[PDB]
Amino acid sequence: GPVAQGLKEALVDTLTGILSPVQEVRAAAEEQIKVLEVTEEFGVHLAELTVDPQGALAIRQLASVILKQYVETHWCAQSEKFRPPETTERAKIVIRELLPNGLRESISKVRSSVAYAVSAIAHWDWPEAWPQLFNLLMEMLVSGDLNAVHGAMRVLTEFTREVTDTQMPLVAPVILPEMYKIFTMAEVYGIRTRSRAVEIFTTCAHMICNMEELEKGAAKVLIFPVVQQFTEAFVQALQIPDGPTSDSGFKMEVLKAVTALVKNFPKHMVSSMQQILPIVWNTLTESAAFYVRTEVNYTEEVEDPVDSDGEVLGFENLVFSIFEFVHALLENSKFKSTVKKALPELIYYIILYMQITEEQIKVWTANPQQFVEDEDDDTFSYTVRIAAQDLLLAVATDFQNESAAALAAAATRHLQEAEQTKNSGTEHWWKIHEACMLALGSVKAIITDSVKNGRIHFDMHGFLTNVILADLNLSVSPFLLGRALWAASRFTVAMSPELIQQFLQATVSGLHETQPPSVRISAVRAIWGYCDQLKVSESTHVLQPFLPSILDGLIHLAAQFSSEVLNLVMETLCIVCTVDPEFTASMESKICPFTIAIFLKYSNDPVVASLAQDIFKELSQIEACQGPMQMRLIPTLVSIMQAPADKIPAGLCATAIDILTTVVRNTKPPLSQLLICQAFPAVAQCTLHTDDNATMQNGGECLRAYVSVTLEQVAQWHDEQGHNGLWYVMQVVSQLLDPRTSEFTAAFVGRLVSTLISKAGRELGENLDQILRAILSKMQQAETLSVMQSLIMVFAHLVHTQLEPLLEFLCSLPGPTGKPALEFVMAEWTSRQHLFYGQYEGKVSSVALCKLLQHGINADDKRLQDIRVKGEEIYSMDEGIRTRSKSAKNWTNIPLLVKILKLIINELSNVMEANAADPLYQIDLQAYLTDFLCQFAQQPCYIMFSGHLNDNERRVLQTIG
């Protein structure tokens, strides 16, 4: 039409205006196209401008760039980054009829954009709206125009990832044969194009795998005969040295395809493994030599005497795929034997891959925090070195004894070769020592166990002395010295007394500031290992004389580093505190002020606060520390609790309360006036004035600790108004059970109430009822299990102490119901009993239900009998997964005592399965429940109780009688 032809001339004018130096024409052309974008045929005109081969390249390039972005944003209304208007059916038909011919374009940048746009469309339109796309692309492959195959192959990479099981029977038989032609015709098609052919093979194979392992008969008919031809072609191509027909990225794709077939069609490739393994092995060893020359020991500053046209891209990613291939063999029951047989040679080459690179040396020296992060056992970093180490850990976990013997032989060889290299004047000989020490330390448990039992030939004492110790006194690289301190600490169990003395001395020297950061960090890790291992072995005596210098070394290091180094020093400082309590107490005068200063300085960091808290906990558990540390720590905690909430960092106050709770829990009564007259009021006041749920909960647990440890002093304390301690506890219990606040304020109030009743209760006895009424009112608001369990556990505890008054009390009010409150407690309790968590909370609730059942029967307490509750949901066994939607398109009501009998049978089931894998604490729940049920089954009432039990419950009862 005439308006479309004029709207297209407008587009051309705007495109030429976007390509102008005068900013005025570009700023106007910018506002113009903001309107053309909403035209119906905007994309149609862009498609025409891009595809037609005679236009100006500057226009075609631009139309294609905007065409891609238009299709990405306008083609589907349900798209995420959708921008209206949606391309109309009229426009889509035209654009779909238009773009395919643009895949034959001579210019690459235009052909690629046309291909990207075609893939965007297929994502939304195939197969419903563009049924002919596949047959259309296949034509382009076999046309003979090498620009058609480049464009069609660039689309087929994405298209085949859009094909599902429904359409794969029609795509796989057709496309795979053509991918084989393209893949094997190395003299016609380029590397990248043949690589895309492997991608399409691997994509089809993954989909065929899903179909085959659901319904057998899909892989015989679609790919199995061509797997033979492809695998043969893949192994031929893996032997091609880098050149005009192969490069690393291409070799990687082949290897990933082979690996995919090994994981998905193992039974079908047993016939080819004899050919593959030697070839991948050649790839593994050659790549090791190339990696070491071009990454490990490569100095950028060295100028080549002879230039080459060199591009070695993505070589690191090839290496990764080699490890992945080995992992695949390891994860197959039949193929893993070939790795087991190759462990001595495999682990030899793994160690080559584990060597520290020059780039790694550059980074770690410049950022000690990266060193801590990269060399942590739980690091998220992924490097050739870490991947290699992971492959070692795998084979060592699968073939413990064979890996120990293989690693011993590998290290012995490496060390022999390293002595020669060192004597040749090669600077980087030490990297073999560093990698060997890393390897042996990574799997230290299997080396020491095999050496102790004489299963392997390995000079342990020579290794510790002539490698580890010797390298500690060498000055070749801080990363060698540091690795040695670490390695020694791993082999603590195999060391002579003469050695452990020298290594501990060397570790303390590793901490001093004259050492480079990586060494000091390594020494900290080493000290952690010594403390941890010598405690388990009950051999901490050898460590005692070094504690003074260790402590000073750690504190001094913390003053110079923050972030992850500090966290490492704080973790190690903490474990040091657990070696010799006598020592920790004598050094309280510096440990505690240091930790407080850290605690406050990094108050904005919860990780440090928790580490400070761990140290405070270890000091609080040492009697000789409590006095001195409390005069120190309590004023600081009190300062935190009185500070304004909006002015201190989040969580600091809640952590301060938890630290206080730990002090109270560990101090034998009576408590200092510092704890009673300063701390207790501050925490009570802090809990009553806070709006933070975490503070409130911790505050209540703190007052619970006071009440539990020294009830007398809480009672005898008063403020100026006469209010005593139990008054403040009551006010807090009131605020936590307040139905007007959050549900979570009561997440732990149940423990406070139960402890208060257990200790006082009688004292201010009218309050008990008022608390229970508050609990009930709070259960009505509460929906979460944890909260409900905390509340319901209050009544569960009262079943053991005041059974009859409880039933009397609960029948004496309606609660938040139109029924007796006893109906409300038992309705909420019985419907949640199966979810309660806690070994202690489980016993209290379990036997409480037994006693409720025992009382309702021996007596004729009809307050219990006459109650009805939910029982079970009746589900079919011949129906699939019952989703929420299946639940709205469709529960028994039974006597309370029957439901209770079932819950008891369930508690027996869960306690049996857990074993087969108040002072009630000591009762064997399994024995008690077993005892209760056997006696219960013989009472005359059981006759009609049994009829109510389902199959699973009856099974549990036959297991017992």
Binding site: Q78, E162, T166, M877, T883, A917
Partner: protein, 86 residues
């Protein structure tokens, strides 16, 4: 057969080894992988149901990443679940 006598498509056996192979606990009952496997299987059935529903609502026959995205966000509980797990 282990998954078959649990009425599950998902692999009880592999889930068991993933638990043991991890530094989670040093003892695991035979009933843990069964329960966990049924949960994993129940969640994928809930997501696939709603994501396939959305694909059917656009007269499409293939689930694509956007359909999973719609299923999750347009369902309060699945949306709530994926924020805490990511």
């Amino acid at each position: 057969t282990r998954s078959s006598r649990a009425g599950l498509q998902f692999p009880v056996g592999r889930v068991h080894r993933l638990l043991r192979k991890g530094n989670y606990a040093e003892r695991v009952g035979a009933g843990a992988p069964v329960y966990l496997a049924a949960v994993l299987e129940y969640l994928t059935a809930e997501i696939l149901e709603l994501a396939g529903n959305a694909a059917r609502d656009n007269k499409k026959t293939r689930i694509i990443p956007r359909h999973l995205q719609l299923a999750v966000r347009n369902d309060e509980e699945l949306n709530k679940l994926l924020g805490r797990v990511t």
